[PDB]
């Protein structure tokens, strides 16, 4: 678990959704960053309250089920199979699935991932996550993430996230990154326009 | 309302309903070839 921050960066001007990622990723490459593979984050939804199940590719076997403010269960992939078996019993929702797919760039112990939350078949928006694997402590590693973001992100740099929340010596968790992703996804689904 | 032994629609003679199997050869409608019954005539009868 390494402190992470995810924010949405608007494409701006008349730059196409893809055109902006191409440019932002080249700007990241212009940090001496080297590509270290590909990352896929695919999330499905249920209208039950509301259930969310998300799975970052960075984690090979885990599937995360988050119940809004309620607890997140980090479970094996067989969890998706249990979900499908229950499916007739379970609620399904209507094409609310949201995915962000983009390149992973490594810059000396910081992994930066810029992706386009493509809703369904049509892209709309952009998610940036900067993670620090060495920084086990969180909520005060904010100075680091902020300085690195001002280096590359510049404008639209986020003024923290609430997943850090109350000041505590509590260690950062894979659950916290998933909660950041869920808030970001709720915003793309509803930003509209 | 159910098949009865010794009746015309004897379940032994074959399958009654499509989603069913006869008790003799335990075969479905397609597999079961149908099995003959017999009637004892109290008096001998000529054959036309």
């Amino acid at each position: 678990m390494g402190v992470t921050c995810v924010s949405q960066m608007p494409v701006a001007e008349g730059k196409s959704v893809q055109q902006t990622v191409e440019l932002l990723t080249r700007k990241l490459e212009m940090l001496g960053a080297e590509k270290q593979g590909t990352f896929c984050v695919d999330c499905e939804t249920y209208h039950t309250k509301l259930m969310y199940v998300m799975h970052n590719s960075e984690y090979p076997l885990s599937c995360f089920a988050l119940f809004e403010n309620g607890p997140c269960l980090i479970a094996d992939t067989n969890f998706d199979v249990l979900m499908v078996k229950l499916k007739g019993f379970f609620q399904s929702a209507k094409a609310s699935k949201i995915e962000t797919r983009g390149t992973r760039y490594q810059y000396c112990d910081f992994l930066v991932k810029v992706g386009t939350v493509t809703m369904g078949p049509s892209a709309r928006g952009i998610s940036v996550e900067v993670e620090y694997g060495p920084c086990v402590v969180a909520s005060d590693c904010w100075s680091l993430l902020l300085e690195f973001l001002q280096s590359f992100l510049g404008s639209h740099t986020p003024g923290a996230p609430a997943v850090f929340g109350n000041r505590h010596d509590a260690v950062y968790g894979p659950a916290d990154t998933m909660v950041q992703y869920m808030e970001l996804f709720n915003k793309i689904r509803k930003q509209q326009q | 309302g159910r098949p009865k032994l010794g009746g015309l629609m004897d379940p032994r003679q074959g399958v009654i309903e499509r989603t069913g199997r006869c008790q003799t050869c335990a075969g479905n409608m397609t597999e079961c070839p149908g099995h003959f019954g017999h009637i004892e005539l109290a008096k001998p009868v000529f054959h036309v």
Partner: protein, 252 residues
């Protein structure tokens, strides 16, 4: 009955006429469904009596041009009554006539007992008695007849205009609502309303004529009309073109 799927609902198919498990696709049954049918795309005494009753029912129905649906309902009612056998002592003709009357009532186009008798050799009294017995045997009931039920037929047989028919229907319904004809038969009330409307419109029909079509004596029509006459302006529809003013309507 998919072997690998305990309690699996097999979906029917029309292309091959087979039932197939939807989750694996296994074909359970080769050509078992018979899509041709599934997809629509010496006489016994009792049966002979029933056949004669059906023939009589058809004759009576055609006498007054009743629809085949009413005929079929009458046939079903007669079958039920005849098998129930509580009316075995009564004539099959009377049972058939009462069944025809009940079928008309249930279909919502009631015919008067006199109307049924006009087409049946059985008398009105016997028809009514058999009707009561049939109702008891069937443990069913028939909605109470209203004046509006007979207006269409009576006005059409009298060849009155649609406006006159509407005026008569409104007059009868309003009279029943106001309770100006308590206890009076609906047929009598309808005949009186039709007479009022006819006398207020250009097409004027005599009491004898209206009684002839409606099956009601001119004296009964006179009584009902006298009961509804004082409030004729109230009964008449607002937008009615009075050829004869309501004040100058016949007084009798």
């Amino acid at each position: 009955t998919c072997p690998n799927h305990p309690d699996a609902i097999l979906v029917e198919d029309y292309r091959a006429g087979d039932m197939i498990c939807p989750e694996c696709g296994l074909v359970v049954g080769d050509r078992v469904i018979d899509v041709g049918s599934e997809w629509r795309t010496t006489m016994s005494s009792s049966d002979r009596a029933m056949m004669n009753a059906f023939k009589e029912i058809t004759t009576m129905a055609d006498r007054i041009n009743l629809p085949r649906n009413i005929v079929d309902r009458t046939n079903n009612l007669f079958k039920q009554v005849y098998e129930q056998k509580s009316l075995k002592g009564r004539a099959n003709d009377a049972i058939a006539s009462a069944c025809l009357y009940i079928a008309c009532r249930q279909e919502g186009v009631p015919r008067t007992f006199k109307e049924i008798c006009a087409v049946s050799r059985i008398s009105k009294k016997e028809i009514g008695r058999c009707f009561k017995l049939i109702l008891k045997a069937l443990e069913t009931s028939v909605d109470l007849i209203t004046t509006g039920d007979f207006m269409s037929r009576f006005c059409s047989n009298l060849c009155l205009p649609k406006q006159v028919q509407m005026a008569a229907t409104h007059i009868a319904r309003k009279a029943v609502e106001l309770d100006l004809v308590p206890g009076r038969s609906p047929i009598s009330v309808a005949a009186a309303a039709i007479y009022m409307a006819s006398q207020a419109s250009a097409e004027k029909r005599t009491q004898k004529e209206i009684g002839d079509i409606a099956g009601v004596a001119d004296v009964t029509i006179r009584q009902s009309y006298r009961l509804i006459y004082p409030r004729a302006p109230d009964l008449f529809p607002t937008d009615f073109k009075f050829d004869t003013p309501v004040d100058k309507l016949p007084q009798l």
